[PDB]
Amino acid sequence: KYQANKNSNRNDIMKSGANPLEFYARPRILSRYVTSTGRIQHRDITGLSAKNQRRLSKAIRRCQAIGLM
Amino acid sequence: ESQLLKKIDKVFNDETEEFTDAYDVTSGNTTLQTQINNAIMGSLSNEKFFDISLVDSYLNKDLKNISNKIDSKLNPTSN
Amino acid sequence: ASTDKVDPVLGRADTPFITRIMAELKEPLVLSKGYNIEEVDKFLAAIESAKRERAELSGLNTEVVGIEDIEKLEDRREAILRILSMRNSENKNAIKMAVELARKEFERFPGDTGSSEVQAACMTVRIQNMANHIKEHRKDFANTRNLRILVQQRQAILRYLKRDNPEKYYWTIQKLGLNDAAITDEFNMDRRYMQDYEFFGDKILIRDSKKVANQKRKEIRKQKRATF
Amino acid sequence: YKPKEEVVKYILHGKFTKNNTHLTFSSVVEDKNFHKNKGLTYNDTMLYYLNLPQKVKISLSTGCLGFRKAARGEYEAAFQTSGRMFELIKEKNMLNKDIEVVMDDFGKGRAAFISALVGKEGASVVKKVVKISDATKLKFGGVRSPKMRRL
Amino acid sequence: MLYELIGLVRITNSNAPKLEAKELSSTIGKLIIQNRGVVRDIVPMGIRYLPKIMKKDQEKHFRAYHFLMLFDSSAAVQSEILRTLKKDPRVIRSSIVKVDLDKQLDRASSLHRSLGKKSILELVNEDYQSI
Amino acid sequence: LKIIPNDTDIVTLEKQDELIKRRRKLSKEVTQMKRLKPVSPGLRWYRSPIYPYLYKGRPVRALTVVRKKHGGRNNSGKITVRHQGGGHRNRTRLIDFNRWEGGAQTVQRIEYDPGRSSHIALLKHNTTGELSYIIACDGLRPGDVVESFRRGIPQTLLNEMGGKVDPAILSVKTTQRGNCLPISMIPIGTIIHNVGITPVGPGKFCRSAGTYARVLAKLPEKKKAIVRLQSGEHRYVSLEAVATIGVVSNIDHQNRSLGKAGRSRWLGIRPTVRGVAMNKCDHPHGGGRGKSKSNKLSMSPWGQLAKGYKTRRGKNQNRMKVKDRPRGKD
Amino acid sequence: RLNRIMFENNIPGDKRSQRFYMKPGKVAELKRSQRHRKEFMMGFKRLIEIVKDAKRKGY
Amino acid sequence: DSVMRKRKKKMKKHKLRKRRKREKAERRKLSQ
Amino acid sequence: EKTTLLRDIRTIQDALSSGSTPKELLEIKQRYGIQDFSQETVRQLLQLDISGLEVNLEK
RNA sequence: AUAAUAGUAAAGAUGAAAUAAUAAUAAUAAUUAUAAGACUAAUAUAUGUGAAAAUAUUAAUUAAAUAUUAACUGACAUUGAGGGAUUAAAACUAGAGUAGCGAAACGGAUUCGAUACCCGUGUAGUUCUAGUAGUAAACUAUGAAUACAAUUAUUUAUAAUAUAUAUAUAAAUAAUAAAUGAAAAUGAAAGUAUUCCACCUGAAGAGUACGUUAGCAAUAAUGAAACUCAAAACAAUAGACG
Ligand SMILES: [Mg+2]
Ligand SMILES: [Mg+2]
Ligand SMILES: [Mg+2]
Ligand SMILES: [Mg+2]
Ligand SMILES: [Mg+2]
Ligand SMILES: [Mg+2]
Ligand SMILES: [Mg+2]
Ligand SMILES: [Mg+2]
Ligand SMILES: [Mg+2]
Ligand SMILES: [Mg+2]
Ligand SMILES: [Mg+2]
Ligand SMILES: [Mg+2]
Ligand SMILES: [Mg+2]
Ligand SMILES: [Mg+2]
Ligand SMILES: [Mg+2]
Ligand SMILES: [Mg+2]
Ligand SMILES: [Mg+2]
Ligand SMILES: [Mg+2]
Ligand SMILES: [Mg+2]
Ligand SMILES: [Mg+2]
Ligand SMILES: [Mg+2]
Ligand SMILES: [Mg+2]
Ligand SMILES: [Mg+2]
Ligand SMILES: [Mg+2]
Ligand SMILES: [Mg+2]
Ligand SMILES: [Mg+2]
Ligand SMILES: [Mg+2]
Ligand SMILES: [Mg+2]
Ligand SMILES: [Mg+2]
Ligand SMILES: [Mg+2]
Structure with a gap:
């Protein structure tokens, strides 16, 4: 019932403090915040702040535009 | 163009390493050591990347003043 | 008709002060972020001297790698200069430098940034910039509104200056290129103005079918015939 | 060097619309003198190996089993046509190579198709899907x- | 203005896959330097296949060599560089992103700054002292 | 007292970017209609596009010939084409449809040619200086540089290796308006004009004002190409046939409005008399008391149906024809 | 596993929605209503958890 | 106002529009 | 001009150290009105203005 | 929508059915490949931003934007009649464009009828570029500014006790005490006050009629009186109905 994934809390780069937009050329890192099909998880799932989520989605969508992801 | 061609040859040399972004590193102490050395030892810094204090000492004669002071105690005064 | 017409937005054409500031912003070797060429060059020379004699004195036992090519050091210098060159930066920096110059040329004493004349000079620089922008983005209605507001604010401060210190008021408005009417009449940047002063050099508004204007024009231009 | 064609895989594709259902069966085929030919380039040849061509062998809809108008799209009709498809695979004996399965839409026939596939009906065919x-x-x-x- | 360019270059004549990246980088670097500009750094990313079979000018593509140039120049030059890249058949895709400079004059490429190293000075000091 | 910042220091390409923006503005620019005050009833519906960049002087005499007026009459002296007659004296201009020579040529001016509907462009070769006339495309203005590659890519680039085929700068050197190339080296989908039929023949199709065609297909094995013409017809053409990039100038020529019969008379158009107004011995529609069409199917004076009757029919049809024109679809 | 993938990617509901067109205003109102209902359900879950805990501890 | 009160005016405008549609020729003749 | 401050300082330093004292030394002597050459002369020539503000702030 | 292939007699639309689709390469299902003209999945809450209309596919150039202290100016401010600018759909005049959707129009069906709800073919529109016009349930049905009034929760930025996430400010959103109110409710206002600017004096006639101004045109602004009546409305209660 209380199975909480705190390993993700410890090991997540985004919640560390780094700027999500700084990773726009890292499809490997960004792929850990998208579904199998490529959709972006909601904030309730990702756990990121509002600012971090907006920057992360912004970076992801950009990566898609450039074609690296 | 000389720098351009030299750096291009070095980078696209096969023997040179190439970052694939497939692995990850295990985890700044050297940078902190440089900064703290420049923070405390000031104009006496021997590090490659000195700070503005060295130029300030030059324009103030502080370095030359101290150098002649110590040298005058050493060779003339035999101390 | 025989009086003088001054644009409330741009003022008299070819104002010496405005053209001089624009020329200053477009000189051979100008840098951004407040780096003057003489200071940067002599600072780099000081850096080289610093390293030279520091290595020589601390390393009386010769441990120095060697002397570096003067051409290589000049390459470093040109690198810095290309980084900091003004014409390689934004126009934000240009407006900032122009505002600095205007402040120093209108301040009553070193450090006066709140005097009405200095305020007016800074808003004049900003108005020039936004007018240049609108002239290429004529549909930018938000920025047109901002420009209108800024021009009206300049009018407000200049009216206060007229009410407080008339001498400085006249001095400043004449130096800028604005006349007392352009400072003391209603203004809206309407299509009427924007066509009369040819903001884009094109027609913007149409007249009603009533031809009374041409009627009076010709009835007063009948001088060639037997009228007066 | 002469052209020749041999099947490498097979693909079974099902579109389950709201009014009807379609099952199609195709073979992914490949030539083995194409690479023998000289002068080709690695990019082209391997692009071909990612885009092998396919040929349709069996193709049937729900109308072939007597279903008309509203009866075309429904659970039992999809079940019947899927079973007929599997019987066709068995009878034309193309079960030796590997099979793949793809589904396109979410009509009433989606459940029926795989119910037939994993039931007693498609027991023989399911043995080759990967x-x-x-x-x-x-x-x-x-x-x-x-x-x-x-x- | 500092600009970060990410570029994908076609791979042909597999004998020298990096030859085309080399040539294109040389050309754009010459453009930048002759246009009163300075390339900050060029770093390759390696041979990597594309997420999808990507098509340009009726030519299929599956893999492309990736490279990253951080260079300082003006808006006009930036534009022309972008238009030349878009024109060039040697490039599949490319993008330029302005690297802000109001806070710091020295900014490392997005890749190192993602690693956590925020300055070319940091990189060079690490190379000199650690290695 | 004089003060001006003369330190332009424009970077090598910044001039190119500046002129690119200027080209964009001049392409954005539009053309207006001339409308005179209707002090007379004949001026009320007289509209004509005005191009302020056109050249007001005379043409080059060495490139013109007097245009002989026939009046619609053939070598027997009888009217064979009606409604054609007196008009303003004119000279025909020897304009080039082949563009064999090659090399770079600068457009000196753009002129009105009364013998056609499109404007014409005077050219001067950069190396030899010979003058020539060609059809001006839409964006052509005095000052531009054009070239023809009908002979082929030049040795100047072949030996220099800079613009040779290996880096494939030829694509961007080709798909630019004004120049002339074979369909073989024109890419698919390009809007072209002055299309030929044969590898050695002049440009025949898509030659009037505002007209263009598109390259739809290439067939190297059959040495052929499929082009869609302004009629909407897909047609086979020789793959090594001529074609120029860009639409033909004077797009607005169709919005012009002659305001009076005298203007048609000047242009050389005599009145047209309807068949119904005639007598039965004349046009079949003739006869009948009052206005009457006589229950006669609309037809020419010589008994040929004038509504939908395909005139080119039977064995003698177009051999080079993939698809017919819309024919009422539009 | 296929069923779970499509359910979690909301492929079926998306397909049902895209069959017909809806005005942007109606789309916005539907989005707001659905978000409110989900928010309310989460809050109700929390309150019920509190009730269960209080019962377990004797309140 | 309430939807009822709005309908009472909606019918007004509908009748007005029918009016202006049907008096088209007369209005044209009067206005030349 | 055909020369720069960095190379000029290099030339004067080389003259001070080795003692060559060529025609270029005289040229730069009139270029900066420096009748004599020494480390003090170099430092004085390259003096910065920031020191003045520092001292004034201290005062 | 085009062509290639291979494969067959159906498919595709309906609550259920029929018109315009289909075996003569021969249709839907399938894989390639060549095109176009709209829109922009998830993130996402319109959170935030903008004066409103509006705004969430990628870069760029330009144009302003938030908080602290530093200095400066020195009441330069609020409101704002007349005016001015922007103003969603739908409209209209010119170019291009027209895939999908779709007023009208013609046919299917359903009906006692069905000038409709359903289905087919689809014009004008919807798109871009120039412009004209200035209204919508243009709504928070709530004009702006200033000084104040009792409490809880969350998120936001910045400020440190100091071992470190425990501490301080303000901002927004939710629920309320007072207060107000016809009540529903509002709750930093629809409370306590102060200065302005736009409106209201019963329905109905009527935003109609006649001038007038403006627009290419639709149409917009301004806007009246006869003859009638004791009517006409809002909140909240019980119910009876679905
Ligand atoms: Mg004001
Ligand atoms: Mg059904
Ligand atoms: Mg005729
Ligand atoms: Mg004629
Ligand atoms: Mg006629
Ligand atoms: Mg006639
Ligand atoms: Mg007669
Ligand atoms: Mg006869
Ligand atoms: Mg008759
Ligand atoms: Mg009301
Ligand atoms: Mg199909
Ligand atoms: Mg989205
Ligand atoms: Mg909000
Ligand atoms: Mg006032
Ligand atoms: Mg007003
Ligand atoms: Mg809308
Ligand atoms: Mg139109
Ligand atoms: Mg339809
Ligand atoms: Mg319909
Ligand atoms: Mg308007
Ligand atoms: Mg209305
Ligand atoms: Mg209203
Ligand atoms: Mg609303
Ligand atoms: Mg307000
Ligand atoms: Mg205000
Ligand atoms: Mg109360
Ligand atoms: Mg009250
Ligand atoms: Mg009230
Ligand atoms: Mg009205
Ligand atoms: Mg009520």
Whole structure:
């Protein structure tokens, strides 16, 4: 019932403090915040702040535009 | 163009390493050591990347003043 | 008709002060972020001297790698200069430098940034910039509104200056290129103005079918015939 | 060097619409003198190996089993046509190579298709499937769809 | 203005896959330097296949060599560089992103700054002292 | 007292970017209609596009010939084409449809040619200086540089290796308006004009004002190409046939409005008399008391149906024809 | 596993929605209503958890 | 106002529009 | 001009150290009105203005 | 929508059915490949931003934007009649464009009828570029500014006790005490006050009629009186109905 994934809390780069937009050329890192099909998880799932989520989605969508992801 | 061609040859040399972004590193102490050395030892810094204090000492004669002071105690005064 | 017409937005054409500031912003070797060429060059020379004699004195036992090519050091210098060159930066920096110059040329004493004349000079620089922008983005209605507001604010401060210190008021408005009417009449940047002063050099508004204007024009231009 | 064609895989594709269902069966085929030919380039040849051609062998809809008008799209009709498809695979004896399965839409026939596949009906065919996936079509914007229905 | 360019270059004549990246980088670097500009750094990313079979000018593509140039120049030059890249058949895709400079004059490429190293000075000091 | 910042220091390409923006503005620019005050009833519906960049002087005499007026009459002296007659004295201009020579040529001016509907462009070769006339495309203005590659890519680039085929700068050197190339080296989908039929023949199709065609397909094995013409017809053409990039100038020529019969008379158009107004011995529609069409199917004076009757029919049809024109679809 | 993938990617509901067109205003109102209902359900879950805990501890 | 009160005016405008549609020729003749 | 401050300082330093004292030394002597050459002369020539503000702030 | 292939007699639309689709390469299902003209999945809450209309596919150039202290100016401010600018759909005049959707129009069906709800073919529109016009349930049905009034929760930025996430400010959103109110409710206002600017004096006639101004045109602004009546409305209660 209380199975909480705190390993993700410890090991997540985004919640560390780094700027999500700084990773726009890292499809490997960004792929850990998208579904199998490529959709972006909601904030309730990702756990990121509002600012971090907006920057992360912004970076992801950009990566898609450039074609690296 | 000389720098351009030299750096291009070095980078696209096969023997040179190439970052694939497939692995990850295990985890700044050297940078902190440089900064703290420049923070405390000031104009006496021997590090490659000195700070503005060295130029300030030059324009103030502080370095030359101290150098002649110590040298005058050493060779003339035999101390 | 025989009086003088001054644009409330741009003022008299070819104002010496405005053209001089624009020329200053477009000189051979100008840098951004407040780096003057003489200071940067002599600072780099000081850096080289610093390293030279520091290595020589601390390393009386010769441990120095060697002397570096003067051409290589000049390459470093040109690198810095290309980084900091003004014409390689934004126009934000240009407006900032122009505002600095205007402040120093209108301040009553070193450090006066709140005097009405200095305020007016800074808003004049900003108005020039936004007018240049609108002239290429004529549909930018938000920025047109901002420009209108800024021009009206300049009018407000200049009216206060007229009410407080008339001498400085006249001095400043004449130096800028604005006349007392352009400072003391209603203004809206309407299509009427924007066509009369040819903001884009094109027609913007149409007249009603009533031809009374041409009627009076010709009835007063009948001088060639037997009228007066 | 002369052209020759041999089948490498097979693909079974099902589109389950709201009014009807379609099952198609195809063979992924490959030539082995194509690479023997000289002068080719690695990019071209391997692009071909990612885009092998396919030929349709069996193709049947629900109408071949006597279902007409409203009966075309329904659970039992899909079950029957799927069973007939599997009997066709068995009888034309193309079960030796590997099989793949793909499904395109979410009509009433979706459940029936795989119920037949994993039931006693498709017991023989299921033994050769290794990849199961869906390839439904969606719009990231796209063209406007018809208006609301005011039923 | 500092600009970060990410570029994908076609791979042909597999004998020298990096030859085309080399040539294109040389050309754009010459453009930048002759246009009163300075390339900050060029770093390759390696041979990597594309997420999808990507098509340009009726030519299929599956893999492309990736490279990243951080260079300082003006808006006009930036534009022309972008238009030349878009024109060039040697490039499949490319993008330029402005690297802000109001806070710091020295900014490392997005890749190192993602690693956590925020300055070319940091990189060079690490190379000199650690290695 | 004089003060001006003369330190332009424009970077090598910044001039190119500046002129690119200027080209964009001049392409955005539009053309207006001349409308005179209707002090007379004949001026009320007289509209004509005005191009302020056109050249007001005379043409080069060495490139013109006097245009002989026939009046619609053939070598027997009888009217064979009606409604054609007196008009303003004119000279025909020897304009080039082949563009064999090659090399770079600068457009000196753009002129009105009364013998056609499109404007014409005077050219001067950069190396030899010979003058020539060609059809001006839409964006052509005095000052531009054009070239023809009908002979082929030049040795100047082949030996220099800079613009040779290996880096494939030829694509961007080709798909630019004004120049002339074979369909073989024109890419698919390009809007072209002055299309030929044969590898050695002049440009024949898509030659009037505002007209263009599109390259739809290439067939190297059959040495052929499929082009869609302004009629909407897909047609086979020789793959090594001529074609120029860009639409033909004077797009607005169709919005012009002659305001009076005298203007048609000047242009050389005599009145047209309807068949119904005639007598039965004349046009079949003739006869009948009052206005009457006589229950006669609309037809020419010589008994040929004038509504939908395909005139080119039977064995003698177009051998080079993939698809017919819309024919009422539009 | 296929069923779970499509359910979690909301492929079926998306396909049902895209069949017909809806006005942007109606789309917005539907989005707001659905978000409110989900928010309310989460809050109700929390309150019920509090009730269960209080019962377990004797309140 | 309430939807009822709005309908009472909606009918007004509908009748006005029918009016202006049916008096088209007369209005044209009067206005030349 | 055909020369720069960095190379000029290099030339004067080389003259001070080795003692060559060529025609270029005289040229730069009139270029900066420096009748004599020494480390003090170099430092004085390259003096910065920031020191003045520092001292004034201290005062 | 085009062509290639291979494969067959159906498919595709309906609550259920029929018109415009289909075996003569021969249709839907399938894989390639060549095109176009709209829109922009998830993130996402319109959170935030903008004066409002509006705004969430990628870069760029330009144009302003938030908080602290530093200095400066020195009441330069609020409101704002007349005016001015912007103003969603739908409209209209010119170019291009027209895939999908779709007023009208013609046919299917359903009906006692069905000038409709359902289905087919689809014009004008919807798109871009120039412009004209200035209204919508243009709504928070709530004009702006200033000084104040009792409490809880969350998120936001910045400020440190100091071992470190425990501490301080303000901002927004939710629920309330007072207060107000016809009540529903509002709750930093629809409370306590102060200065302005736009409106209201019963329905109905009527935003109609006649001038007038403006627009290419639709149409917009301004806007009246006869003859009638004791009517006409809002909140909240019980119910009876679905
Ligand atoms: Mg003001
Ligand atoms: Mg059904
Ligand atoms: Mg339809
Ligand atoms: Mg005729
Ligand atoms: Mg004629
Ligand atoms: Mg006629
Ligand atoms: Mg006639
Ligand atoms: Mg007669
Ligand atoms: Mg006869
Ligand atoms: Mg008759
Ligand atoms: Mg009311
Ligand atoms: Mg199909
Ligand atoms: Mg989205
Ligand atoms: Mg909000
Ligand atoms: Mg006032
Ligand atoms: Mg007003
Ligand atoms: Mg809308
Ligand atoms: Mg139109
Ligand atoms: Mg319909
Ligand atoms: Mg308007
Ligand atoms: Mg109205
Ligand atoms: Mg209203
Ligand atoms: Mg609302
Ligand atoms: Mg307000
Ligand atoms: Mg205000
Ligand atoms: Mg109360
Ligand atoms: Mg009250
Ligand atoms: Mg009240
Ligand atoms: Mg009205
Ligand atoms: Mg009520």
